[PDB]
Design a binder for this molecule. Structure first.
Ligand code: RBF
Ligand code: CL
Ligand code: CL
Ligand code: CO
Length: 117
């Protein structure tokens, strides 16, 4: 698929998605128009590990890049493993301007290893 990513605006409440790539639409099965303005957690669901969610939340607060692997859901309810790479984007003034999150679909690290401390 074309590279899956979204861009959020941390200068607006709770990181709304301001851009979603064609690859993200293809991976997730959502339309662009229905994605825009959402927080990226809309892809989560019952099987998503809340400990991994908390890691993300801490990295966003700290404006620190992070990679995690977590369960996400397509619009039709299909589960997929998402290796999510989140990167803060700063402007020339050093000010946070965007986050970008790139999704790679796959159980790259087997669940039994991911689950160790
Ligand atoms: C740019 C960006 C992209 C994100 N993409 C995803 C994603 O693909 N899947 C997901 O489960 N959470 C994603 N999140 C994390 C989610 O929005 C939220 O920050 C965490 O669930 C903590 O509440 C993303 C966050 C940002 C800032
Ligand atoms: Cl967010
Ligand atoms: Cl958050
Ligand atoms: Co300033």
């Amino acid at each position: 698929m074309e590279k899956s990513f979204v861009i959020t605006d941390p200068r607006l409440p709770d990181n709304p998605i301001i851009f979603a790539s064609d690859g993200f639409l293809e991976l997730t099965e959502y339309s662009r128009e229905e994605i825009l303005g959402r927080n990226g957690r809309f892809l989560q669901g019952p099987e998503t590990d809340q400990a991994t969610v908390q890691k993300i939340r801490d990295a966003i607060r700290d404006q620190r890049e992070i990679t995690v692997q977590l369960i996400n859901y397509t619009k039709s309810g299909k589960k997929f493993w998402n290796l999510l790479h989140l990167q803060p984007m700063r402007d020339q003034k050093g000010e946070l301007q965007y986050f970008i999150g790139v999704q790679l679909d796959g159980e790259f690290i087997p669940n039994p290893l991911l689950g160790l401390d």
